[PDB]
């Protein structure tokens, strides 16, 4: 049976909650649990009220995100296919209750500073069910870091880390992220000079440039184990394919073109498309502390541009990692 909100969010944890983002199907808070930062995603399920312009998901419809979050969380401790490039999942609970007023206060603060596209979640009754996912805190998203990166060399590390992480997940799980916009790439400072990954038993390293990248938020993702596919079936979703104003919204249409609107199949070219979108953001929407005015830096820029114009001729993140000249 479900637990009360207080099981997951006792007073002190609740008091430290700050809202950090949102989607149609969730609110996300950062807080501190046992002196440790965490991110908490809270999703309303099974109720009759419209929420953020949509009917609520059923428990069965949230299960794919839970399962995929659990699988990717395991990758940091695997051996043949190992990466720390996703994020840890600490716990999942089913909670029952109306929304805590301290969370509403956090929600209000975010709406007042950043502005929200969601309904204030103050209409839920005391029988309302929610899924609460607690993640390891992964740092600051790439969008918020768009003016904060040191140079194009940092952008190259980030691209290499992302590619490697996706390759490891493709190899182990036939994984596609499918929604890898720049809010779903997190950066955290590290004193490690090199990061390690293993792809089908071969270990390699990547210079960190002082940052560990984490890929997050598996709401649209797909994977499989033992021929059992877990995915988000968007084949009847109209709106996902009619966005504009950002190349992000072209990617949804390009994925659908690639897969013929069959979301259960494995099309790792979708990972390549997202990587192309991310390279585009790096070349166009980032400001760097150090400009590309030395020969060394100018060469890195040329290499990233050459990656941008050639990567769409590759079939998967694995193909990019193993064959693209950027990573040699
Ligand atoms: C609002 C979320 C989606 C995200 C937007 O940049 N911000 C953060 C920041 C730190 C952080 N650590 C873990 C997570 C997180 C949040 C939602 C889903 C997942 N898988 C991971 N997040 N999300």
Shared-domain flag, residues 162 and 126: no
Residue 313, helix vs strand vs coil: helix
Q: For residue 96, what is the enclosing H or E element?
A: strand 89-96
Is 126 in the active site?
no
Q: Give the CATH number of the domain where residue 317 resides.
A: 1.10.510.10
The DSSP-derived string for 275-298 is: HHHHHHHHHHS--BSS-S-SHHHH
Q: Which domain holds residue 201?
A: 138-328
Within the chain, residue ranges assigned H as helices are 5-8, 11-15, 59-74, 101-113, 152-173, 247-259, 269-284, 295-310, 317-323
Active-site residue, from 179, 237, 239, 250: 179
Cβ neighbours of 8 (radius 10 Å): 22
- Of 245, 243, 161, which Cα lies nearest the Cα of 255? 243
C-alpha of residue 32 to centroid of ligand 1, in Å: 14
Question: Is the Cβ atom of 170 under 6 angstroms away from ligand 1?
Answer: no
The CATH number of the domain holding residue 108 is 3.30.200.20
Task: Say whether both 233 and 268 belong to one domain.
Answer: yes
Distance 200 CA to ligand 1 centre (A): 28
Distance 65 CA to ligand 1 centre (A): 13
Residue written as tokens 């590619």? 163
37 CB contacts (<8 Å, ≥6 apart)? 30, 31, 137
Residue 273 shares a structural domain with residue 190:
yes
Q: Whose CA is nearest to atom 19 of ligand 1?
A: 217
User: Is 141's C-beta closer than 6 angstroms to any atom of ligand 1?
Assistant: yes
Q: Ligand 1 atom 17: the closest Cα is on which residue? A: 217
CA-wise closest residue to 191 among 212, 163, 219: 212
Do residue 148 and residue 63 come from a single domain?
Answer: no
Helix, strand or coil, per DSSP, at residue 325 = helix
288, 233: one domain:
yes
Domain identity same for 38 and 28 = yes
Q: Is 202 left (phi over 0), alpha (psi -120 to 50) or beta?
A: beta
Overall domain count for the chain: 2
Show Cβ contacts of residue 15 under 8 Å, excluding neighbours closer than 6 positions: 102
The answer to whether the CB of 225 falls within 8 A of the CB of 215 is no
The Cα–Cα gap between 277 and 306 comes to: 14
- Is residue 21 within 6 Å of ligand 1 at its C-beta? yes
Q: Point out the domain boundary residue: 101, 119, 137.
A: 137
Does the CB atom of residue 217 touch ligand 1 within 6 A?
yes
Among 39, 110, 114, 117, the mutation site with the greatest number of ligand 1 atoms within 8 A of its Cβ is 39
CA dist., res. 32 & res. 11, Å (int): 12
Q: How far is CA 318 from CA 135, 208, 221, in A?
A: 26, 20, 17
> Is the CB of residue 131 less than 8 Å from the CB of residue 254?
no
- Residue 216 alpha carbon, nearest atom of ligand 1: 20
Pocket test for ligand 1, best of 23, 28, 133, 145 (most atoms within 8 A of CB): 28
- CB of 183 within 6 A of ligand 1: the answer is yes
Identify the DSSP state of 10.
Answer: -
Give me the DSSP letters along 196-252.
EEEETTEEEEEE-TTEEEEE---TT-BEEETTEEE----TT-SGGGS--SSHHHHHH
Which residues line the annotated binding site for ATP? 20-28, 41, 136-141, 179-184, 217-219
Domain boundary among 120, 137, 154: 137
The β-bridge partners of 26 are: 23
Ligand 1 atom showing the smallest separation from residue 139 Cα: 10
Residue that has been written with the tokens 């995603």 in this structure: 41
Number of CB atoms found within 10 A of residue 79's CB: 8
CB 177 within 8 A of CB 218: yes
Residue showing tokens 């990617």: 251
Experimental approach: X-ray
Quote the tokens at residue 104.
């509403």
Are residues 154 and 289 located together in one domain of the fold?
yes
Resolution, rounded to a tenth of an Å? Answer: 1.8
Is the beta carbon of 23 within 6 A of some atom in ligand 1? Answer: no
**Whether residue 177 sits in one domain with residue 306:** yes
């Amino acid at each position: 049976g479900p637990v009360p909100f207080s099981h997951c969010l006792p007073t002190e944890k609740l008091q430290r909650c700050e809202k950090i983002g949102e989607g149609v199907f969730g609110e996300v808070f950062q807080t501190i649990a046992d002196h440790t930062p965490v991110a908490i995603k809270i999703i309303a399920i099974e109720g009759p009220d419209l929420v953020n312009g949509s009917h609520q998901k059923t428990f069965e419809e949230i299960l794919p995100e839970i399962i995929i979050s659990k699988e990717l969380s395991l990758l940091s401790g695997e051996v043949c296919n190992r990466t720390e490039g996703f994020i840890g999942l600490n716990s999942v609970h089913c909670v029952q209750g109306s929304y805590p007023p301290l969370l509403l206060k956090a929600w209000d603060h975010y709406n007042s500073t950043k502005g929200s596209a969601n309904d204030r979640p103050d209409f839920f009754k005391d029988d309302q069910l929610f899924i609460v996912l607690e993640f390891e805190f992964g740092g600051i998203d790439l969008e918020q870091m768009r003016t904060k990166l040191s140079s194009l060399a940092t952008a190259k590390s980030i691209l290499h880390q992302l590619t490697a992480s996706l390759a490891v997940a493709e190899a182990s799980l036939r994984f596609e992220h499918r929604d890898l916009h720049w809010g779903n790439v997190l950066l955290k400072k590290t004193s490690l000079k090199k990061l390690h990954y293993t792809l089908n038993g071969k270990s390699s390293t990547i210079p960190s440039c002082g940052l560990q990248v984490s890929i997050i938020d598996y709401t649209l993702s797909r994977l499989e184990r033992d021929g059992i596919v877990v995915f988000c079936d968007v084949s009847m979703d109209e709106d996902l394919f009619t966005g504009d104003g950002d190349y992000q919204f072209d990617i949804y249409r390009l994925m659908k073109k690639e897969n013929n609107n069959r979301w259960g199949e494995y099309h790792p070219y979708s990972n390549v498309l997202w990587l192309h979108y991310l390279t585009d953001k790096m070349l166009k929407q980032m400001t760097f502390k150090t400009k590309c005015n030395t020969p060394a830096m100018k060469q890195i820029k040329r290499k990233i541009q050459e990656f941008h114009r050639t990567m769409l001729n590759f079939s998967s993140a694995t193909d990019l990692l193993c064959q693209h000249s950027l990573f040699k």
